Coordinates of C-alpha atoms in Angstrom, one line a residue:
X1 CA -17.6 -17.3 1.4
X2 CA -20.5 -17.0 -1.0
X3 CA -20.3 -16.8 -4.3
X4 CA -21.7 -13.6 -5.2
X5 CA -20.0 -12.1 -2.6
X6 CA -16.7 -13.8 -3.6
X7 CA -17.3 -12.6 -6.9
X8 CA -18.0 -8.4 -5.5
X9 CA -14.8 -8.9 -3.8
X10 CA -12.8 -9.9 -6.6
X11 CA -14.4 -7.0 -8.7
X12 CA -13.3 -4.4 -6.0
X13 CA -9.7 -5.9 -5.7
X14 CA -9.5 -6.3 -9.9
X15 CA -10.2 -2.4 -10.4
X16 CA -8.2 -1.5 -7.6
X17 CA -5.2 -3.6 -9.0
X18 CA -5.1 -3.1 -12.4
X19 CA -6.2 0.5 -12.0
X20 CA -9.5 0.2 -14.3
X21 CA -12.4 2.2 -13.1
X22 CA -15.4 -1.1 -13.9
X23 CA -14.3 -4.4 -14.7
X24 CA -17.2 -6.9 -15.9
X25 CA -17.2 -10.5 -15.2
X26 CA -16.0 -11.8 -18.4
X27 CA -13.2 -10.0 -18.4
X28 CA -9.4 -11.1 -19.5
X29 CA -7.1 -10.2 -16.4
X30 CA -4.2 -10.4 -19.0
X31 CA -6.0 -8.9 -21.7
X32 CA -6.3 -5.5 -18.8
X33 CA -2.8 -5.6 -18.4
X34 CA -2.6 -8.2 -15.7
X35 CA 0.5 -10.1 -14.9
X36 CA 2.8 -12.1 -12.1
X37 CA 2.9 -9.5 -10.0
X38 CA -0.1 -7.8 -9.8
X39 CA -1.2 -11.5 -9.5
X40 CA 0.1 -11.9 -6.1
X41 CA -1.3 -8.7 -5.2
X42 CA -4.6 -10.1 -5.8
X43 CA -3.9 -12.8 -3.2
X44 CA -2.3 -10.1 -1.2
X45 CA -6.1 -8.4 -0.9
X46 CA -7.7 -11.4 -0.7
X47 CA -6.5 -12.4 2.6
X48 CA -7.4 -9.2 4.1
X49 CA -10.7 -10.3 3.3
X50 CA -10.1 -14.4 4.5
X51 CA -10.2 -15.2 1.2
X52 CA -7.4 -17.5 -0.7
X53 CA -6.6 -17.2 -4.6
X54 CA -4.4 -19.9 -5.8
X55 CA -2.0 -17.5 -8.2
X56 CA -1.6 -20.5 -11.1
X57 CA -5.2 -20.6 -10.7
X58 CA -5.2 -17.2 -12.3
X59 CA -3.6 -18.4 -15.1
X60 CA -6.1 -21.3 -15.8
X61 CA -9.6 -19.4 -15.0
X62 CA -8.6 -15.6 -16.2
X63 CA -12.0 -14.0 -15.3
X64 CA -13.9 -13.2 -12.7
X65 CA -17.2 -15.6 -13.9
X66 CA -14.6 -18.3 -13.9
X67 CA -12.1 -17.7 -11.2
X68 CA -14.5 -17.3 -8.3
X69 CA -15.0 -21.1 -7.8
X70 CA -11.3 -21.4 -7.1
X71 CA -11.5 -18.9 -4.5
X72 CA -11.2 -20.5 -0.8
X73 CA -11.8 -19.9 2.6
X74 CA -8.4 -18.7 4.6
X75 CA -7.4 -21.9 6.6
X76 CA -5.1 -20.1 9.0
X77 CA -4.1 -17.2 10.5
X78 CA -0.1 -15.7 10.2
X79 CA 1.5 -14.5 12.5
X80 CA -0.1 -11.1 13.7
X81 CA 2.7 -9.9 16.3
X82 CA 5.8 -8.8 16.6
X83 CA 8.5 -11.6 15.3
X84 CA 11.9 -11.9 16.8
X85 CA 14.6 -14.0 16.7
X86 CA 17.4 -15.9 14.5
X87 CA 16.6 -16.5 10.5
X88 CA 18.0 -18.9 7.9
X89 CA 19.6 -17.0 5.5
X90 CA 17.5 -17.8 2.0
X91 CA 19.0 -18.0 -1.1
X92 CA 19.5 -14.9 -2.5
X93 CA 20.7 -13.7 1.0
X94 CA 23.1 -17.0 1.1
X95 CA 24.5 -15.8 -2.7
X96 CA 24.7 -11.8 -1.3
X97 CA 27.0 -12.6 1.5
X98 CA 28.9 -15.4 -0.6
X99 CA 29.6 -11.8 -2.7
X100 CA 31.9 -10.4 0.0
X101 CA 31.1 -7.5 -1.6
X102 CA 33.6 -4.3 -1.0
X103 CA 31.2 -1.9 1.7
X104 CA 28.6 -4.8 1.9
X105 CA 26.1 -2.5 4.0
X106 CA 25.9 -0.1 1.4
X107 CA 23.9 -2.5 -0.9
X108 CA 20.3 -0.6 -1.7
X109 CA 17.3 -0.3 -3.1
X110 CA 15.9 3.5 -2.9
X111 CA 12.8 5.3 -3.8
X112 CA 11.7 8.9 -4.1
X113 CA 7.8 10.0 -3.9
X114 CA 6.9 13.7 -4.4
X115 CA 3.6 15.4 -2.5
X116 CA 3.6 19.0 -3.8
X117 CA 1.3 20.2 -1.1
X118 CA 4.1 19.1 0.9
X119 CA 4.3 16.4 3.7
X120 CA 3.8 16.4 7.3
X121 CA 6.8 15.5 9.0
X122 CA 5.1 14.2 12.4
X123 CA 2.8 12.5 10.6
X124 CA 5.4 10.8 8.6
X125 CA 7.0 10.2 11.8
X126 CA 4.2 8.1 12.9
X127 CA 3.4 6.3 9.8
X128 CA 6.8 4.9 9.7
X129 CA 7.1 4.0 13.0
X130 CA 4.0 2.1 12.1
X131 CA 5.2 0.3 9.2
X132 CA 8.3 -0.9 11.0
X133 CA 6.9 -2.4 13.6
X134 CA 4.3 -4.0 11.0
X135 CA 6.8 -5.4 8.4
X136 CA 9.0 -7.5 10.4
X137 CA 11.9 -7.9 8.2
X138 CA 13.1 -4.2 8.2
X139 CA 14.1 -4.6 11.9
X140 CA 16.5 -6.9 10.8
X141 CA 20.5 -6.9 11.5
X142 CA 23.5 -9.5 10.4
X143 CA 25.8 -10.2 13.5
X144 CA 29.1 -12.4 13.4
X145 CA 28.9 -15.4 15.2
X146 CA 32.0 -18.0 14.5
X147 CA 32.9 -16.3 11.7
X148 CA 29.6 -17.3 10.3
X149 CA 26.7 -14.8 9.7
X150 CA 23.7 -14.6 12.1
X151 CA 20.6 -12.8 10.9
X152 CA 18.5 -12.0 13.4
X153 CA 14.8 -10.0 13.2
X154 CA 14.6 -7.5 15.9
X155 CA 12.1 -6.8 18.3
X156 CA 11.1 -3.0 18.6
X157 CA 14.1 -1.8 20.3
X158 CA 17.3 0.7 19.4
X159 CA 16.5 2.6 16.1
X160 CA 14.5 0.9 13.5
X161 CA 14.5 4.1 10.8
X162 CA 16.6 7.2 10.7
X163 CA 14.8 10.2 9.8
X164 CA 16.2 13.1 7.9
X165 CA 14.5 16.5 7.6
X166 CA 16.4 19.0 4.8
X167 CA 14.9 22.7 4.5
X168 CA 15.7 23.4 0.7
X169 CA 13.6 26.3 0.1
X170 CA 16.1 29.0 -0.3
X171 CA 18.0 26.5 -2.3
X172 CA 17.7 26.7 -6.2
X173 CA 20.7 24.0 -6.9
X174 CA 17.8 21.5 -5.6
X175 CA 18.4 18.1 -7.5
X176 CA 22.4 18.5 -6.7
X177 CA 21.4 19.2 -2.8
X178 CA 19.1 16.2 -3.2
X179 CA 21.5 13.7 -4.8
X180 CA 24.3 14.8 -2.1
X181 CA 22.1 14.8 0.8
X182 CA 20.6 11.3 -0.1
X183 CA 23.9 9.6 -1.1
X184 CA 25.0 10.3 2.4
X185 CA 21.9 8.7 3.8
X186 CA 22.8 5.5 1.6
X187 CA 26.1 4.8 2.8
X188 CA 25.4 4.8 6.3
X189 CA 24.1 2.0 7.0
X190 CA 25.4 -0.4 9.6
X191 CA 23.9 -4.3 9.1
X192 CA 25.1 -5.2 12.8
X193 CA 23.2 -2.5 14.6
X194 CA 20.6 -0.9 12.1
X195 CA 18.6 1.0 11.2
X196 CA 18.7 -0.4 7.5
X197 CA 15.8 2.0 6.7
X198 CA 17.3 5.7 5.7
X199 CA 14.6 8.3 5.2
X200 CA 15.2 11.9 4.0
X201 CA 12.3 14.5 3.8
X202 CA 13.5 17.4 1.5
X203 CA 11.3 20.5 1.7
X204 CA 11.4 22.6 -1.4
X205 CA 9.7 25.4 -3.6
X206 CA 8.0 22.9 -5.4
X207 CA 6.5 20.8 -2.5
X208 CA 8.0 18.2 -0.8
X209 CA 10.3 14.9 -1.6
X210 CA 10.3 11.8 0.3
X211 CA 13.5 9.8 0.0
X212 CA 13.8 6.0 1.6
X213 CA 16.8 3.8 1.2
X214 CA 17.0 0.6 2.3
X215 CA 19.1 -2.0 2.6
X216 CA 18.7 -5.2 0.0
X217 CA 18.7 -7.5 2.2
X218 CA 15.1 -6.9 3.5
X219 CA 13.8 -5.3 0.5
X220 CA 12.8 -6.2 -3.3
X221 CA 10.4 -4.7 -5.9
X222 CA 7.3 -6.6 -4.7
X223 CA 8.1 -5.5 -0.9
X224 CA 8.2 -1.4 -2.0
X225 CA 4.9 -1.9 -3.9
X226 CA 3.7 -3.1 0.0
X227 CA 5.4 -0.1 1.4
X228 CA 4.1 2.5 -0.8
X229 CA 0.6 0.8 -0.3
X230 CA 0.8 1.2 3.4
X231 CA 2.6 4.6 3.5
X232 CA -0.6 6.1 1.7
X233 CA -2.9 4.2 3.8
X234 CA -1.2 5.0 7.2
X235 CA -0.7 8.8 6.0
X236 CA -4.6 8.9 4.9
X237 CA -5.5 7.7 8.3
X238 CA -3.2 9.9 10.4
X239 CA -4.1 13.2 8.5
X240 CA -7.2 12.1 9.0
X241 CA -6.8 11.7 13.3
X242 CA -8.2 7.9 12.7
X243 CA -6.0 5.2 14.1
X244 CA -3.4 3.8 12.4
X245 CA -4.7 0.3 10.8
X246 CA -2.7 -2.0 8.3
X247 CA -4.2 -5.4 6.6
X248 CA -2.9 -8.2 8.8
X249 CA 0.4 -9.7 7.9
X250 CA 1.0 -12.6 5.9
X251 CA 3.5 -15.0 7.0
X252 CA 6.9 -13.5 8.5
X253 CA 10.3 -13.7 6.6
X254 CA 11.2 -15.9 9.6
X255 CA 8.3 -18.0 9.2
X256 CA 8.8 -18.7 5.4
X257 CA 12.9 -19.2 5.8
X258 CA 11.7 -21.8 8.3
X259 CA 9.6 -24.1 5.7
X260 CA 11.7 -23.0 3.1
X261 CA 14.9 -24.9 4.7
X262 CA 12.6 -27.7 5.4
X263 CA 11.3 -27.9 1.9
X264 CA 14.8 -27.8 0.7
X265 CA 15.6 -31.3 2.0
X266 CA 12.1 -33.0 1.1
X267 CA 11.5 -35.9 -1.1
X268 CA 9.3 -34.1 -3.6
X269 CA 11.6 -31.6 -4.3
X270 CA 15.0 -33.5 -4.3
X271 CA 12.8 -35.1 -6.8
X272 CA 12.8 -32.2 -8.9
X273 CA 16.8 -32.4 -9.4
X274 CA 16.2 -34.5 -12.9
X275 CA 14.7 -31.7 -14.4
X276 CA 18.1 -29.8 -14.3
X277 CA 20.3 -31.7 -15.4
X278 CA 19.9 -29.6 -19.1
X279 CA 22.6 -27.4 -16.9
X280 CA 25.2 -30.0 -17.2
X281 CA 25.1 -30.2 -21.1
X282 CA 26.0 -26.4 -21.3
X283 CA 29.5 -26.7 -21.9
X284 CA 30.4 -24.7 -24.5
X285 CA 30.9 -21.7 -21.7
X286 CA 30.3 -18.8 -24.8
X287 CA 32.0 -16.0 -23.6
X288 CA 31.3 -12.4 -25.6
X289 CA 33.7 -10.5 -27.0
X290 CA 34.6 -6.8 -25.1
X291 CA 35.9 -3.9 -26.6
X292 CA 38.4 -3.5 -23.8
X293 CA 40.4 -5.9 -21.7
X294 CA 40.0 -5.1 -17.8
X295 CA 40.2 -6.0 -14.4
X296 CA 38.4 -5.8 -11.5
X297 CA 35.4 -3.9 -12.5
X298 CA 33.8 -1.9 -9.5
X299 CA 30.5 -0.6 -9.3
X300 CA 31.4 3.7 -9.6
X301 CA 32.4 1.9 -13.4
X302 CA 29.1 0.7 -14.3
X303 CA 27.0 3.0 -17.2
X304 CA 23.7 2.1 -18.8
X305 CA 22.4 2.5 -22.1
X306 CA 18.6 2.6 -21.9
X307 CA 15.8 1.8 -24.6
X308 CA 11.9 2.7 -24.7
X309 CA 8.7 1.9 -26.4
X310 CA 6.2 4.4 -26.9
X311 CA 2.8 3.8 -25.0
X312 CA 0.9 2.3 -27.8
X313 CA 3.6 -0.3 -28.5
X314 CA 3.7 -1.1 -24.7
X315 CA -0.1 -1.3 -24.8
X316 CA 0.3 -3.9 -26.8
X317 CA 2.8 -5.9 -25.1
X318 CA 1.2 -5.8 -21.8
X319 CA -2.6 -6.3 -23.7
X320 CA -2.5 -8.0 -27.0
X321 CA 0.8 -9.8 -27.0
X322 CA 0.4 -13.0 -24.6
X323 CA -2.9 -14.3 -25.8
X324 CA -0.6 -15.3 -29.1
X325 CA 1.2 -18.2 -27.7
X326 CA 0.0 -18.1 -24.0
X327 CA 3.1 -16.9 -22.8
X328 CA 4.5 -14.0 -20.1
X329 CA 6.6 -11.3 -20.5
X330 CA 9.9 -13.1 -19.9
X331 CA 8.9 -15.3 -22.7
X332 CA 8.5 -12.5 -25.3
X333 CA 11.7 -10.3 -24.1
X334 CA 14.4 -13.5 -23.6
X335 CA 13.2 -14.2 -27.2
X336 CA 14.1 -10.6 -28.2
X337 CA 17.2 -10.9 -26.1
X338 CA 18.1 -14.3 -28.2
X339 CA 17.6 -12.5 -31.4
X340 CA 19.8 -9.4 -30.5
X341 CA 22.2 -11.3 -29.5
X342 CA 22.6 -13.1 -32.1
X343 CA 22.9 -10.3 -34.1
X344 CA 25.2 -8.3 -32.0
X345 CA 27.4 -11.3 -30.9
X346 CA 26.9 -13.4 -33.6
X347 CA 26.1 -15.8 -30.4
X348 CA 24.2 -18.8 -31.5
X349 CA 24.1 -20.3 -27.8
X350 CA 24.7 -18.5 -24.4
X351 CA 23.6 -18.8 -21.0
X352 CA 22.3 -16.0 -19.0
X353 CA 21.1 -15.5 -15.5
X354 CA 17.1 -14.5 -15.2
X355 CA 16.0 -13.1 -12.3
X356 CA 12.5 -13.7 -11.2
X357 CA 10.2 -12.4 -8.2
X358 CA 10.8 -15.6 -5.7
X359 CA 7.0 -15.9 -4.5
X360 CA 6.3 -19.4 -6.2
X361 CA 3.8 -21.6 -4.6
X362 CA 5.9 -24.1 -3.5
X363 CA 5.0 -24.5 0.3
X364 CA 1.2 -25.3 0.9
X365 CA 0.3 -23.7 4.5
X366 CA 2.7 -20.4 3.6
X367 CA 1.4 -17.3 2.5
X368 CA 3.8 -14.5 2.2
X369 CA 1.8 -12.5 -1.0
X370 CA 1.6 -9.3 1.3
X371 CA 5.5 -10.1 3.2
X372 CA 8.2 -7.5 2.6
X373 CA 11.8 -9.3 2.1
X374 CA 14.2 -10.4 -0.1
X375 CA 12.6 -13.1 -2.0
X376 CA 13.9 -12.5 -5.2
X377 CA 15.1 -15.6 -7.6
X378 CA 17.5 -16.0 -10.5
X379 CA 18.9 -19.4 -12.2
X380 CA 20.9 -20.1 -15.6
X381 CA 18.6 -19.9 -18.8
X382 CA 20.3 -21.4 -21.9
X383 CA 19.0 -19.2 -24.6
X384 CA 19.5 -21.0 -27.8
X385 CA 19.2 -19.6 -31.5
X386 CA 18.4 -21.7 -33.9
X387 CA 15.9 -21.0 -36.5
X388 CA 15.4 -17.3 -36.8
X389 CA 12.6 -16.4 -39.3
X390 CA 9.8 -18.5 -38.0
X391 CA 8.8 -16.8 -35.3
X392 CA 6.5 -19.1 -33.8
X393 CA 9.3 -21.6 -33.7
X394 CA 11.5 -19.4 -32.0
X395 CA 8.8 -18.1 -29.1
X396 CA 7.7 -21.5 -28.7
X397 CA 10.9 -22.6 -28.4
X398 CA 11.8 -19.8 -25.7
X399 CA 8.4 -21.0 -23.7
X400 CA 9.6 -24.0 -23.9
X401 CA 12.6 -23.3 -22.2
X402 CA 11.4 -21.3 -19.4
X403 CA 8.4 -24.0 -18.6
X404 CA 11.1 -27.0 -18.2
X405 CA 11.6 -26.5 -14.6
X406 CA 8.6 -26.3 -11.6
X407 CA 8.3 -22.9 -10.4
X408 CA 9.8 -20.6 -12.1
X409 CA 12.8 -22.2 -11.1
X410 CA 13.4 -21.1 -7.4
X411 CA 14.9 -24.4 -6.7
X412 CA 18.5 -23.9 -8.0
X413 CA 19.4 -22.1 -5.6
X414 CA 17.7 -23.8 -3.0
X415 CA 19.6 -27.1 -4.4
X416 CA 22.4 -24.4 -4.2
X417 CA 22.4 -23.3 -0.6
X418 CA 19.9 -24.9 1.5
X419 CA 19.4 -28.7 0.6
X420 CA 22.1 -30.3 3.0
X421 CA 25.3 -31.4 0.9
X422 CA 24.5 -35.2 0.6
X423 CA 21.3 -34.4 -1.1
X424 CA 22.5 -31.6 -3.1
X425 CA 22.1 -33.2 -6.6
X426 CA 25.0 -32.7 -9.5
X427 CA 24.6 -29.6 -10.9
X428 CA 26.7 -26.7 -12.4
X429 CA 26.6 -25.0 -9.6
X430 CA 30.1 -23.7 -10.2
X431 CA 28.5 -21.5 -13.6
X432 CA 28.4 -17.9 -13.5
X433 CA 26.7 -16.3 -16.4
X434 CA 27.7 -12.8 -18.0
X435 CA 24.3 -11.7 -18.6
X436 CA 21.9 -10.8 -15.6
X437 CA 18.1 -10.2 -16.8
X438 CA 15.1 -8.8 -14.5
X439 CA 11.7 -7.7 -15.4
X440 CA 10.5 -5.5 -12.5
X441 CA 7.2 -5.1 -13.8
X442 CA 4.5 -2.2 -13.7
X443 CA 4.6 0.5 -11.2
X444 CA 2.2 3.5 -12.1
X445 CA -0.7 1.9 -10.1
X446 CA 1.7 1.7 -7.2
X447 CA 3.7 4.9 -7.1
X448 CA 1.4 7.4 -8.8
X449 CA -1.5 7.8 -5.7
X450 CA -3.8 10.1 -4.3
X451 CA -1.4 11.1 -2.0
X452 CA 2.0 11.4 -3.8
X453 CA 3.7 10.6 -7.0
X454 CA 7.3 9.8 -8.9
X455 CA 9.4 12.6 -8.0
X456 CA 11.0 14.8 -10.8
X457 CA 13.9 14.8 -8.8
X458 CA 14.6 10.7 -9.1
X459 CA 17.6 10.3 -11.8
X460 CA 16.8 6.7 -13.8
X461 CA 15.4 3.4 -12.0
X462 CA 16.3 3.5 -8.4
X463 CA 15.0 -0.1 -7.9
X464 CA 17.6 -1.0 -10.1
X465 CA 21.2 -1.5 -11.1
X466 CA 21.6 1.8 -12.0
X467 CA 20.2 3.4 -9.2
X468 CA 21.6 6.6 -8.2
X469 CA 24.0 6.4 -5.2
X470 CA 22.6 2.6 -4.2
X471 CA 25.4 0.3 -4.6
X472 CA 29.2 0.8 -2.9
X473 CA 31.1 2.8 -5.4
X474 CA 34.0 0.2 -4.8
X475 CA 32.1 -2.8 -4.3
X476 CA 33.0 -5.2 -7.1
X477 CA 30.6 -5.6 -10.6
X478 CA 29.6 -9.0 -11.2
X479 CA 28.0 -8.9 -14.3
X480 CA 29.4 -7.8 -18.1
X481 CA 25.9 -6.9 -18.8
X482 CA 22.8 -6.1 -16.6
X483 CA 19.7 -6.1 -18.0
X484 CA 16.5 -4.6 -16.2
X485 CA 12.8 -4.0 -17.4
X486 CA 10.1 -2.1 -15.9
X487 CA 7.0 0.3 -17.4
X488 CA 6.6 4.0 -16.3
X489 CA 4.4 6.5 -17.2
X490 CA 3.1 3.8 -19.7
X491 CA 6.2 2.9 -21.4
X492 CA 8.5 0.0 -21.1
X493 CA 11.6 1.0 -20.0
X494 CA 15.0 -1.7 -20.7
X495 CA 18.7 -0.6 -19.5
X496 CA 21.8 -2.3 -20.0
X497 CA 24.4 -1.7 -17.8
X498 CA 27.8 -2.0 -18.1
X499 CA 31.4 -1.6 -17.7
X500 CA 32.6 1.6 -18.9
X501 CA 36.0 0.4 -19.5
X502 CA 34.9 -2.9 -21.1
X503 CA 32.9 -1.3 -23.6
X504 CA 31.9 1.8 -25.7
X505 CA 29.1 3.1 -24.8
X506 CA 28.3 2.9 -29.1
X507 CA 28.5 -0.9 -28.9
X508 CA 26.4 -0.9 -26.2
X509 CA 24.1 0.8 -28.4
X510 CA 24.2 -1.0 -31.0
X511 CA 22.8 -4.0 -28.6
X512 CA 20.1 -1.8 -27.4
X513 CA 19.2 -0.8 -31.0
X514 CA 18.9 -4.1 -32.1
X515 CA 17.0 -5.6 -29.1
X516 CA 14.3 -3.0 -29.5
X517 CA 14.1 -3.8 -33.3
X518 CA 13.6 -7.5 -32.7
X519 CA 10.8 -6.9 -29.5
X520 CA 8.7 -5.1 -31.8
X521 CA 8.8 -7.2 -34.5
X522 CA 7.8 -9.9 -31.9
X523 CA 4.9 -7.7 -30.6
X524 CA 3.6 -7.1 -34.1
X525 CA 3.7 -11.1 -34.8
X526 CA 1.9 -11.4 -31.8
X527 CA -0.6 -9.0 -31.9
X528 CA -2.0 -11.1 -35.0
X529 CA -1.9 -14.2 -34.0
X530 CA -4.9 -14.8 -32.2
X531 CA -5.5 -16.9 -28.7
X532 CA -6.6 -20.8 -29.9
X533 CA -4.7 -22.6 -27.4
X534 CA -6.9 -24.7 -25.8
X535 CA -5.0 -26.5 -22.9
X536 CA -2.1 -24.8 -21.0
X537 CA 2.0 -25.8 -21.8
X538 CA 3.1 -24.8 -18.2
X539 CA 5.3 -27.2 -16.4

């Protein structure tokens, strides 16, 4: 495409993304808040337009004057129609199963979105029918086949969504109504015969409340920012009496498991397994001290202590912060994590489990930036304390650590589960850390619309571990502590959750305390050192 015209495009789609009204050509996507995620929804909108962004390209050229050359002509179309038929489990699907979790279908992520001049129920009828049939992966069931599992995309047949309409108006106990109401919804879901979609439309005084729970194992924080997009897009069009139209697919679920498998047993990547073998010198297997000794921890156990910043402070971290050492935001919070626990544990080394969004551009012809799914990563991270006081040491020294392995490092659990035994290199593969950490990321451009917003009536972060009602009350914990990030309404937001009978909720405290001490002092370092780096670290 041209390059004036490339460069319009990219100025519509940067506004649009990082929710700024005029963005000029010069400017810094990360210095306006841009990050990972809302990277790959800049390749998202650029296919709609047959355009391809390279995300690590992003990285390199940050603005638009520079970027635009990078830009390139769509190659090939996905698949457009309706996909069917059996998928390799991937990873994270592979490690959810190997769980045997207690009540495994009732395993969820859930959102609530609030219209107060209420919703139309037919026309949310429609909508949804529309945005099953166009994300693939939510027809999905799990069938037993030999014993073994068999997951397998359904065509558009039996129920793909089940639809709840509750009439609340002469209720005035409406949050209680709500959480009963919903927590029905979310342990009814059956994985051999669907739906794993749940809605719930509750009516109320206020306006009305748009519940949707659905299954993990089809869903992840990238895929609900999809569905929120096309649920206001869909619902603008229908109230409209235009037809129905979403941007054309990216590659299926079942496409990308496909090359994924493949991938998992080429050369170049078995070539890769050098680059772990750090993982093998871990052996001093730190385990932190509880308050409690217990047993067989089950999810209706699990409490969370939560910290905030104020918006300023977040400003800063999502503005100001990275252009210090060239880093992202996992950089700057594992190094706060390091420091608190340090202080907390006195824990010089430990290794925790980072979680990560999964959409690394590992396979050339795939495309799955606009693909709802499961595609969600995590691997061991050593964190290692060493020299406390210089600063720069110890952030460069975290960068360091997260930039030793390609990708991000989706391929330990592709070495895990995919890459056929013979292959499989010698890892640790056997290690199973305490500590779980996710950064979800930002959320106000995608929740907070024309058409709706966050509902008052959501209790905490329903996308994550704490979620209200989303996990089997008896399924089984699998982490001492659970650690989950996100900004809303301007803030960042970080929980720990945790046992209830293998800690006090005041030592808990004390952790969060501490970790929000040592992140701002990090921010304020950052915030004065200024950007000089003139060629990247990245692996």
């Amino acid at each position: 495409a041209p390059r004036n015209e490339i460069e319009e495009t990219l100025v519509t789609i940067w506004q649009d993304v990082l929710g700024i009204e005029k963005i000029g050509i010069k400017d810094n996507f990360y210095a306006l808040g841009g990050d990972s995620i809302k990277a790959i929804q800049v390749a998202a909108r650029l296919h709609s337009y047959q355009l391809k962004l390279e995300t690590k390209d992003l990285l390199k050229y940050p603005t638009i004057d520079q970027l635009v050359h990078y830009i390139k002509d769509s190659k090939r179309r996905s698949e457009q129609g309706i996909v069917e038929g059996e998928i390799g489990l991937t990873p994270i699907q592979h490690w959810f199963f190997e769980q045997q979790f207690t009540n495994m279908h009732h395993w969820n992520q859930s959102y609530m979105l609030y219209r107060p001049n209420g919703f139309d129920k037919e026309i949310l009828l429609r909508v949804f029918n529309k945005i099953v049939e166009h994300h693939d992966a939510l027809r999905m069931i799990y069938k037993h086949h030999n014993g073994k599992i068999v997951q397998i995309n359904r065509g558009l047949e039996g129920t793909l969504f089940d639809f709840y309409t509750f009439d609340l108006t002469a209720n005035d106990n409406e949050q209680q109504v709500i959480c009963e109401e919903s927590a029905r919804l979310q342990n009814s879901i059956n994985l051999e015969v669907g739906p794993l979609v749940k809605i719930a439309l509750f009516h109320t005084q206020n306006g009305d409340h748009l519940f949707m729970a659905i299954h993990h194992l089809v869903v992840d924080g990238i895929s609900w920012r999809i569905l929120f997009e096309d649920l206001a897009t869909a619902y603008e069009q229908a109230m409209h009496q235009q037809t129905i139209a979403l941007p054309e697919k990216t590659d299926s679920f079942k496409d990308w498991s496909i090359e994924l498998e493949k991938y998992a047993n080429s050369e170049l990547f078995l070539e890769e397994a050098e680059y772990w073998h750090h993982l093998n010198y871990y052996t001093d297997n730190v385990q932190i001290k509880k308050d409690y000794v217990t047993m067989n921890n089950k999810q209706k156990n699990i409490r969370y202590v939560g910290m905030e910043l104020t918006i300023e402070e977040t400003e800063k971290l999502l503005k100001n912060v990275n252009k210090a050492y060239r880093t992202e935001i996992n950089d700057i919070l594992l190094t706060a994590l390091g420091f608190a626990l340090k202080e907390w544990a006195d824990i010089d080394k430990i290794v925790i489990n980072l979680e990560g969004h999964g959409r690394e551009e590992i396979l050339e012809q795939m495309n799955i930036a606009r693909t709802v799914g499961w595609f969600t990563s995590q691997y061991p991270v050593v964190l290692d304390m060493q020299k406390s006081d210089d600063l720069s040491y110890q952030i460069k020294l975290m960068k360091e650590n997260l930039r030793r392995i390609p990708n991000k490092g989706i391929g330990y659990e592709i070495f895990k589960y995919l890459t056929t035994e013979y292959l499989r290199p010698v890892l640790p593969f056997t290690l199973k850390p305490e500590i779980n950490f996710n950064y979800l990321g930002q959320f106000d451009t995608d929740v907070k619309t024309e058409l709706f917003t966050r509902s008052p009536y959501s209790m905490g972060n329903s996308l994550g571990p704490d979620g209200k009602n989303n996990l089997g009350p008896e399924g089984e914990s699998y982490f001492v502590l659970n650690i989950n990030g996100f900004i809303e309404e301007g803030k960042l937001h970080i929980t720990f959750s945790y046992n209830e009978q293998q800690y006090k909720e005041d030592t808990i405290q004390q952790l969060s305390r501490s970790y929000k001490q040592h992140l701002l002092a990090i921010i304020e370092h950052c915030v004065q050192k200024e950007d000089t780096e003139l060629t990247p670290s990245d692996f």
